[PDB]
Amino acid sequence: PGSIDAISQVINIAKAHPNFPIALQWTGGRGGGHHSFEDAHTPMLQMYSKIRRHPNIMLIFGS
Amino acid sequence: MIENRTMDGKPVSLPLLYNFNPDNGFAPISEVMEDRNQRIKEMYWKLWIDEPFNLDFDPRDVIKGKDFEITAKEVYDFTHAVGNNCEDFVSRPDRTMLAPMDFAIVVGWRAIIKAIFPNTVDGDLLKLVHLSNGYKMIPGAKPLQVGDVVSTTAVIESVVNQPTGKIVDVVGTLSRNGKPVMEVTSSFFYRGNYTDFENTFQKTVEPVYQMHIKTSKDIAVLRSKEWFQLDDEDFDLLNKTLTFETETEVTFKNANIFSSVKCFGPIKVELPTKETVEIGIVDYEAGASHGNPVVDFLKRNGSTLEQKVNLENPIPIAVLDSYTPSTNEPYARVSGDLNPIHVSRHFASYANLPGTITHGMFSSASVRALIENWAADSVSSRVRGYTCQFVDMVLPNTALKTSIQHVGMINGRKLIKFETRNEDDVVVLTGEAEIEQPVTTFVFTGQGSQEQGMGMDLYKTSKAAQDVWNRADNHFKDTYGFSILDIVINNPVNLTIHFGGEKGKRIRENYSAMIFETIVDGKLKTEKIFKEINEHSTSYTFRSEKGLLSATQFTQPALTLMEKAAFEDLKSKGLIPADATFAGHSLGEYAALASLADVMSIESLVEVVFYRGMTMQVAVPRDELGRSNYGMIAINPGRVAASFSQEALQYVVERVGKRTGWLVEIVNYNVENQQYVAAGDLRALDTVTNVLNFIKLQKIDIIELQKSLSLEEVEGHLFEIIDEASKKSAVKPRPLKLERGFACIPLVGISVPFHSTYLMNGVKPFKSFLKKNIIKENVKVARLAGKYIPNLTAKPFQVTKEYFQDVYDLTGSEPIKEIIDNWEKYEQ
Amino acid sequence: IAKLEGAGDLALYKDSVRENEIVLNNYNERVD
Amino acid sequence: MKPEVEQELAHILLTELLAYQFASPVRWIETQDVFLKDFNTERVVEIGPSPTLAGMAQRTLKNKYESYDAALSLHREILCYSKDAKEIYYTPDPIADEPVKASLLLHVLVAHKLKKSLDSIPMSKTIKDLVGGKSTVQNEILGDLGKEFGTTPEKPEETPLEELAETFQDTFSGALGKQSSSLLSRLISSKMPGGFTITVARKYLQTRWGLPSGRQDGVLLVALSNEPAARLGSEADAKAFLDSMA
Amino acid sequence: ELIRTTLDAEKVFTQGLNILEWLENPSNTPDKDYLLSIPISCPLIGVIQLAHYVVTAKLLGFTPGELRSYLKGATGHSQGLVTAVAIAETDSWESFFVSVRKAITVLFFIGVRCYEAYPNTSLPPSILEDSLENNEGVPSPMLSISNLTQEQVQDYVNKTNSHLPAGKQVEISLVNGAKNLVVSGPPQSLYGLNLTLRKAKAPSGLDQSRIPFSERKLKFSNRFLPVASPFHSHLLVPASDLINKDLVKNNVSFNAKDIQIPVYDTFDGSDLRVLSGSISERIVDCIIRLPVKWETTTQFKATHILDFGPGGASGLGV
């Protein structure tokens, strides 16, 4: 996911399939290749709490 | 029947007596009525007045209360009781604590209420209704401060028996250091049947009424009236303004017929100087009459000094919810209105009231605190009079819903009108307030915006504009043979005046009289403007390219009228404060003085400003066609460099003049370090736009490299920068197209250096023209002093030596210097 | 825009509608 | 000084001030600083066709009167005659079945929780704007939209109802659901359709006006936002209610 | 009783303090504008806390001493530090009303003496109608700025305080979160600050998803609080001295040996039980003078936290 709205869309997919593992590859705009306009930190601080409510989401940081 | 809530704790007892007659057994109990009203008074006297009890004192006589020192303690308490939060009453540092005007009743009460106690004004105090209370600040007087010692004096105005009861009208006068501050007006009602016409009277002070005697069948009417005594019978009344300061004693014999009518007072005339003088007395006396004819006359044939004018549509200000408190003990503590019907359930029940009712004065103060917050932008001093009608009674813990409306104007004061309703939707309070507008300055624009049809929207609608334009247009038609309205509406390219006929020869003599003075090599040189126009001339044509409305002599008076007509519309709607300060920018000053100080007539104003526009057309030699060698540029000294100030420009420009020997000066000081205007020789303006084009790019900071680094080498540095631009700008085509540079923009159209020393020469003729058109008699000093801020001296106009001295230093006038020399015309 | 053009944070309202026209051009290129 | 004389001299001075006025520079800096400072003018009125001197007063006030004004708590008004006439003169100016939209339902749910009319809420406005004060009601609205539409965006009280209505419109299908159903159940029973319950109230619409299930719900939701509150006598009146709502 | 004993209370408490009457008979209750005033709202917010601590203790079949034995510590935000220190004294139902009496009297002198120091005056209606349309509250001496770092807010107050003279200057008063702040000072001066902040905030219906992050307008809330005094401000320093005097007169002191859990000072975060000076004098400084660093306060470790405060969901708990 690029943005907060996309992180919300991932959470909703991991809610729908609570046993299925889901690697949430969070990337900030500072990444090489096609990139977002997003900070690496700010959106994680806002959504981390909500993400960790779902144990099937394995949370991977890059960029 | 006992009151426990008294002045000194010692409870107070009303002995109500009743005859028990067992012989009459249907109705064995009968109230003793003999000296019932003088038991009820004795009780209320213990509760209200602080003197030895005595009801043998004449109502007609003056009542005087104790001197009352205001203290922060008292004012603090009072404001919490009524719910008045306004900042002016809180103790902050520096500024002094004000008292609310409501506080007047706390000072007044012991005096005011004593007026309903006498034997001759006999009533059941338990059935007394407070009908209406009012405050009225005497004009000029500052509101009550916190150190002040305030004398009171109250006077019974009317005692009048009506069918339904007796109405007592009292007028309390608060005084500080010998002078009146405000009048408190209370109307009380004793319900009953009174036939006490011996002890009934009316002793008003009528509002001042003025008559302008214009005609001879106005003077012939006044001479018919027995009551118009003059000291000098031969005295000439024609074109005089008489003011009648009149008071009317009236005794009664019946409900409607008066036993005796008496009107009397000085008749005053306004002198040329606007001081008043007594030249007469009103002395009307009558027996059994139905009217005061004197006041009936002056109402129709005269006018009051102030006139309320209603807005087209009332404006809703707010709809607010005050709440009456659970108990009426705290209002009663600060006020000294210990009236038992407000605190004691038993006395309330004995007066047939629906409960221990809220004091009316509490409701009045409460609502006046909302008027003061929503209509005076929470500034105490602005609320200037306030008058309350008590309609229905209010019980504790009620939800009052007051609707406030701006309804009208009176001589710059807003005319506020409110009503208050309870939850049942019943009117409880109604009232009015006069509220000053915020401290105001009017500033009249000068030349620049001069568009076709300017001011013509306001000429369709406004009666007051129409007077201004129609008066001016008729003066210009009969003096200079053109309509200024045609010019403003149609903006023609050419305009031929014709000098045909009796009326044309007169118009031609007006153009031939107009002279200027220029420096022509050697000396001053008197000339006729319009040199072509001589006694054999039959026409004269005014030409432009674009339109005559952009030709200064037509622009100058158009612009000035637009403003005078805008303003006279405002004044007619009541929107002009009496104390407003004013200034105009350049030509602005004329509009401003015609408007706020009636110095000139309309006819004289447009003459002067036409001659001004004419003198500022001809002062420069412009040989070629409509093209001169002078101009003027607008400078932004912030844009050239952040450290470049009004000390930098005042040097650069003074040096460019002293160096190149070409006239350049700063003429407008507009906005500090942001807007100046320089005017002079177009060449010397082309150096200044290059010298400033230089210092922008070069970044050489005058103040840094000025007195700090190199002393009197600044002149060395600068003369170098001047001489490479100066001798580059001397080789242009004779009438040099002037272009713009980072800091400096050229003002298009302006072809003359007005506001410079260049036309200190063309002043004698313009001075002599003002002296014809500005008469001494039309100058009211009161109307200029400390209000008019001239352009010459940016110092509020004053008629003192230091002001004359200061003018001489800027002007070098001999008619001024000869006044300073013999400033002992203090001995007339 | 029309409210604020009645008279910063206007160049931002302008490139928010410039940007929507880039996307909108792709959608009606897709419908074609 | 005798008034006759004071007048003579004022006449002289006034004549000389005007005479020389065009032969000396216009000191409008010092002038501004006389009426802005030494009179504490709370209101400058520029009489003139354009607003030149009102522009100049605005710029002069900002440049060197920010710290002076704040320290007197002196609010100042700069009014041109040409542009601000209304301030100066005091004259202001004053049948086919369709499942319910989210944009209506959201409007009604918010309108009902604020005790306010279905048009006094503009849709182009955030939930934290409408109840800015009380934070309890804010969350209580978010709790209601939570039950009603299920899944919300992130910070829904920062996106305007207009904008947020769309985000719901996608994954919702004209379903009244938990919260809205429970609000209508109260509206009918608690108000005085004295005997006629939901089924009897629905059939009336469907028979008299010709409105099936989808459109039926839509009318009931507008009834919830225009709650009668006052006791109403009989069906005759409660029929006249449902007529005005439809 | 405390209105009669105080020299000129009755002039402040116009409509009295008979809270029995107001609850028994809702219609003889005063108006919501009197009740919000700090003289009558301080002590009554004390009551609502102590009341919740009662209905808690009773329904668990505890005496107040037994409930505070299970507490590992207690603390309070702003004026709650008074009903915290009172709970740390309590023991049995009989010697409970002596703690309550002590709490209420401290909370009554704070409410009285602070009103007299800096009273809330009427704002011009121009200011009021401007605040309501731009979705700041009714102006008040207390401005809550959500979603800005303490550093970012302290800039906007230095800007604002540059133009203002000493006794009108605003200051950060509560530091509730990293990005939750409350600025105290005169309501004119705070309206000043809200102008500076209107510049810097983004229109809510903009969409900044396509702008580089470090060029986005910051998206934040500023809102006047519904209080009537500026707590934790230099404005109230006059009162400090007069409350210290009117506790010695009502014979009210909190002593280290009587308070039997740690009570967390709301500035340092330290324990009150460890002090050289008067505990009562410090609890006044902490409400009147000193700011509230809530993070350094609530730096104790603990599995559970009980919020007795007013507001519930809206309260200090959440």
Residue contact E210–C16, C-beta within 8 A = yes
* Residue B586 a catalytic site member: yes
- Cα distance between residue B86 and residue B647, in whole Å: 45
CB atoms within 10 A of CB B299: 13
How far off is chain D from B782, nearest CA to CA, in Å? 10
- The phi, psi pair for B149, rounded to 5°, reads -105, 120
Residue E16 with chain B: CB contacts under 8 Å: 326-327
Token couple for E259: 């308070």
| Residue B142 vs residues B176, B384, E306: alpha-carbon distances, Å | 10, 10, 58
> B322, B364, B586, B595: which one is catalytic?
B586
List all chains that touch chain E, counting a touch as 3 or more CB pairs closer than 8 Å: A, B, C, D
Environment class of B288 (CB within 10 Å of its CB; exposed 0-12, middle 13-18, buried 19+): exposed
Q: Domains of chain D by range and CATH?
A: 1-93 (3.90.25.70), 94-246 (no CATH)
Q: Are strands A57-62 and B523-528 parallel, antiparallel or unpaired?
A: unpaired
CB atoms within 10 A of CB B315: 14
How far off is chain C from E206, nearest CA to CA, in Å? 7
Nearest to B380 by CA among B207, B185, B143, B131: B143
Which residue in this structure is represented by tokens 């309320």? Answer: B308
Token couple for D38: 């030494």
Cα-only R_g, chain B = 36
Beta-bridged to residue B135, according to DSSP, are: B184, B386
Environment class of B426 (CB within 10 Å of its CB; exposed 0-12, middle 13-18, buried 19+): exposed
- Work out the angle between the directed axes of helices B463-479 and B502-512 (0-180°, nearest 10): 90
List all residues 6 or more positions away from D169 whose beta carbon is below 8 Å from its beta carbon: D101, D102, D103
Distance of CA B184 to the CA centre of its chain: 23
CB atoms within 10 A of CB B114: 20
Environment class of E229 (CB within 10 Å of its CB; exposed 0-12, middle 13-18, buried 19+): buried
Residue E120 with chain B: CB contacts under 8 Å: 85
- Cα distance between residue B618 and residue E192, in whole Å: 53
- Cα distance between residue B730 and residue B690, in whole Å: 13
How far off is chain A from D156, nearest CA to CA, in Å? 11
Q: Is residue B318 less than 8 Å (CB to CB) from chain E? A: yes
Residue contact A47–D153, C-beta within 8 A = no
Distance of CA B352 to the CA centre of its chain: 49
Which residue in this structure is represented by tokens 């002593």? Answer: E255
What spatial distance separates the first Cα and last Cα of chain C, rounded to whole Å? Answer: 30
Token couple for B769: 């023209």
DSSP conformation letters of D19-86: HHGGGS-EEHHHHHHHHTTSS--SEEEEESSS-HHHHHHHHHHHHHSHHHHHTTT---EEEETTT-HH
Nearest CA in chain D to E310: D136
Environment class of B508 (CB within 10 Å of its CB; exposed 0-12, middle 13-18, buried 19+): buried
HSE at residue B748, side-chain half, CA atoms within 13 A, is 3
- Cα distance between residue B678 and residue B34, in whole Å: 93
Q: Is residue B374 less than 8 Å (CB to CB) from chain E? A: yes
The number of residues in chain A equals 63
Q: Is residue E198 less than 8 Å (CB to CB) from chain C? A: no
Which residue in this structure is represented by tokens 């109802």? Answer: D161
Token couple for B820: 């300073």
Best residue in D130, D135, D137, D141 to probe E by mutation, most E CBs within 10 Å? D135
Best residue in B308, B441, B793 to probe D by mutation, most D CBs within 10 Å? B441
User: What resolution in Å is listed for this PDB structure?
Assistant: 2.8
Q: Are strands B258-270 and B247-252 parallel, antiparallel or unpaired?
A: antiparallel
Environment class of D196 (CB within 10 Å of its CB; exposed 0-12, middle 13-18, buried 19+): middle
Q: Given its phi and psi angles, is residue B204 left (phi above 0), alpha (psi -120 to 50 degrees) or beta?
A: beta
Please check whether residue D101 is in contact with residue D169, taking contact to mean a CB–CB distance below 8 angstroms. Answer: yes
Residue contact B77–E11, C-beta within 8 A = yes
Beta-bridged to residue B744, according to DSSP, are: B635, B741
Check residue B741 and report its DSSP letter: B
> E41, E78, E99, E184: which one is catalytic?
E78
Chains C and A touch, using 3 or more CB pairs below 8 Å: no
What spatial distance separates the first Cα and last Cα of chain A, rounded to whole Å? Answer: 13
- Cα distance between residue E274 and residue B584, in whole Å: 72
| Residue B65 vs residues B51, B171, B523, E239: alpha-carbon distances, Å | 10, 13, 77, 39
Best residue in E147, E206, E213 to probe A by mutation, most A CBs within 10 Å? E213
Nearest to B529 by CA among B510, B552, B548: B510
Report the greatest alpha carbon distance in chain B: 132
Residue A37 with chain E: CB contacts under 8 Å: 209-213
Nearest CB to B397; choose among E11, E27, E119:
E27
- Cα distance between residue B473 and residue B483, in whole Å: 5
Torsion of CA B225, B227, B229, B234, to 10 degrees: 0
B295: helix, strand or coil: helix
Q: Is residue E311 less than 8 Å (CB to CB) from chain B? A: no
- The phi, psi pair for B576, rounded to 5°, reads -105, 115
Nearest CA in chain C to E208: C16
Which residue in this structure is represented by tokens 């002062």? Answer: B619
Please check whether residue E289 is in contact with residue E266, taking contact to mean a CB–CB distance below 8 angstroms. Answer: no
Task: Show the CA angle centred on residue E81, arms to residues E75 and E83, nearest 5°.
Answer: 100
Nearest CA in chain A to D150: A12
- Cα distance between residue B652 and residue B693, in whole Å: 13
DSSP conformation letters of B220-288: HHHTT-TTEEESSTT---TTEEEEE--EEEEEESSSSSEEEEEEEEEEEEE-TTS-EEEEEEEEEEESS
Q: Is residue C19 less than 8 Å (CB to CB) from chain E? A: yes
Nearest CA in chain C to E216: C12
Which positions in chain A have a beta carbon within 8 angstroms of at least one beta carbon in chain E? 3, 29, 37-39, 42
Residue B398 with chain E: CB contacts under 8 Å: none
Residue C13 with chain E: CB contacts under 8 Å: 203, 206
Beta-bridged to residue E183, according to DSSP, are: E143, E172
- Cα distance between residue B652 and residue B656, in whole Å: 6
Task: Show the CA angle centred on residue B70, arms to residues B67 and B71, nearest 5°.
Answer: 135
